[PDB]
Design an enzyme around this catalytic site. Structure first.
Site, PDB file in Angstrom:
ATOM      1  N   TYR A  57      48.347  49.622  51.158  1.00  0.00           N
ATOM      2  CA  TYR A  57      47.086  48.873  51.315  1.00  0.00           C
ATOM      3  C   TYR A  57      46.778  48.593  52.769  1.00  0.00           C
ATOM      4  O   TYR A  57      47.316  47.677  53.366  1.00  0.00           O
ATOM      5  CB  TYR A  57      47.064  47.567  50.529  1.00  0.00           C
ATOM      6  N   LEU A 198      39.121  42.796  36.478  1.00  0.00           N
ATOM      7  CA  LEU A 198      37.658  42.742  36.445  1.00  0.00           C
ATOM      8  C   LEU A 198      37.039  44.122  36.491  1.00  0.00           C
ATOM      9  O   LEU A 198      35.839  44.244  36.748  1.00  0.00           O
ATOM     10  CB  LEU A 198      37.106  41.921  37.627  1.00  0.00           C
ATOM     11  N   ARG A 245      35.443  32.268  45.428  1.00  0.00           N
ATOM     12  CA  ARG A 245      35.806  33.034  44.239  1.00  0.00           C
ATOM     13  C   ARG A 245      37.229  32.804  43.724  1.00  0.00           C
ATOM     14  O   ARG A 245      37.469  32.865  42.536  1.00  0.00           O
ATOM     15  CB  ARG A 245      35.575  34.507  44.497  1.00  0.00           C
TER      16      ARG A 245
END
Ligand SMILES: NC(=O)c1ccc[n+]([C@@H]2O[C@H](COP(=O)([O-])OP(=O)(O)OC[C@H]3O[C@@H](n4cnc5c(N)ncnc54)[C@H](OP(=O)(O)O)[C@@H]3O)[C@@H](O)[C@H]2O)c1
Length: 281
Positions: A57, A198, A245
């Site tokens: 990542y 999600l 969030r």
């Protein structure tokens, strides 16, 4: 006063909250870093203590973000990272673990995963995982993107039965593992880590999730996570660059889906009725 995060036990008896935090695509934009760090810190403060990252990542950058977010509070976090399969040779894995620990700025990862299945024989990689465990460099190992056949091969590997987790794609739009893999991992005592819970945000346009969100005065994202909270043996790892969030995702735990919400989700997002090829991102 919000409701607590349910907890899931690993085979070794260690318990984590069933809602953790993702980091893929973090550390790619210098203008977001401060917010990404703050987002993870926010989730830690709120009890989203598992943080999932990987060497790949941002080639170490997401690991460095995680390293910042846990500065001064290592013992509060359950840090998961991963080795790419092209590195997962006997000596490669050790070398990759050392880079991850340098990037994270810590002595020991809590859980270290093979990221997906590659050309190095499993016994090699597991051998490297067991030596790292003995060296105090990882605390546990697991796997990712392993289907049933892949899981079975671990039994041929000595120490393969030490597998601590399988991180696979799972959300309302990708329910395929419900036919075989999830039941196996539950019977086996092995937490499934649901990645992209999600569906990378694609679920958030779904009209049935919106409707159900509206009834609960919640958001579609909160509903998608509330569903996965209902699934025993599952840890969900949503990712957000936004501290607002992160708070929202935490509060998905205060939703109690009704029996009728669950029927409707099943109708709108049908479970597999036959074996499905493992979906991977
Ligand atoms: N093992 C593997 O092969 C593998 C594969 C995929 C993922 N993973 C792991 O799983 C993690 C989660 O999956 P993912 O990152 O692919 O996708 P995901 O968590 O399902 O969703 C990510 C997207 O949702 C947005 N978002 C998050 N919370 C939201 C909310 N409350 N309202 C609106 N939008 C929201 C984020 O945007 P913002 O950031 O802009 O808020 C982001 O673009 C990854 O970060 C990674 O750690 C592992």
């Amino acid at each position: 006063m919000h409701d607590p995060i349910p907890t899931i036990a690993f085979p070794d008896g260690r318990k984590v909250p069933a809602l953790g935090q993702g980091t893929w695509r973090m550390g790619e934009n210098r203008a977001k870093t401060a917010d990404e760090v703050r987002s993870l810190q926010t989730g830690l403060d709120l009890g989203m203590t598992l943080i999932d990252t990987a060497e790949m990542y941002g080639d170490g950058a997401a690991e460095r973000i995680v390293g910042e977010a846990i500065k001064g509070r290592r013992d509060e976090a359950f840090v998961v990272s991963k080795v790419l399969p092209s590195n997962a040779s006997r000596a490669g894995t050790v070398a990759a673990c050392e880079r991850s620990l340098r990037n994270l700025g810590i002595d020991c990862v809590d859980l270290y995963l093979l990221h997906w299945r590659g050309g190095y024989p499993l016994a090699e990689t597991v051998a490297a995982f067991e030596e790292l465990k003995k060296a105090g460099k990882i605390r546990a190992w697991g796997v990712s993107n392993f289907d049933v056949d892949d899981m079975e091969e671990l039994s041929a590997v000595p120490d393969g039965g030490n597998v601590a987790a399988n991180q696979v794609l799972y959300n309302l739009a990708r329910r395929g593992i419900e036919f075989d893999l999830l039941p196996r991992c539950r019977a086996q005592g092995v937490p499934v880590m649901a990645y992209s819970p999600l569906d990378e945000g694609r679920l958030l346009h779904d009209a049935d999730l919106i409707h159900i969100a509206k009834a609960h005065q919640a958001t579609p994202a909160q509903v998608a996570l509330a569903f996965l909270k209902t699934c025993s043996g599952v840890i969900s790892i949503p990712k957000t660059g936004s501290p607002e969030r992160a708070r929202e995702n935490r509060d998905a735990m205060d939703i109690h889906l009704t029996t009728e919400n669950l029927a409707e989700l099943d109708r709108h997002f049908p479970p597999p009725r036959r074996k499905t090829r493992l979906e991977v991102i």
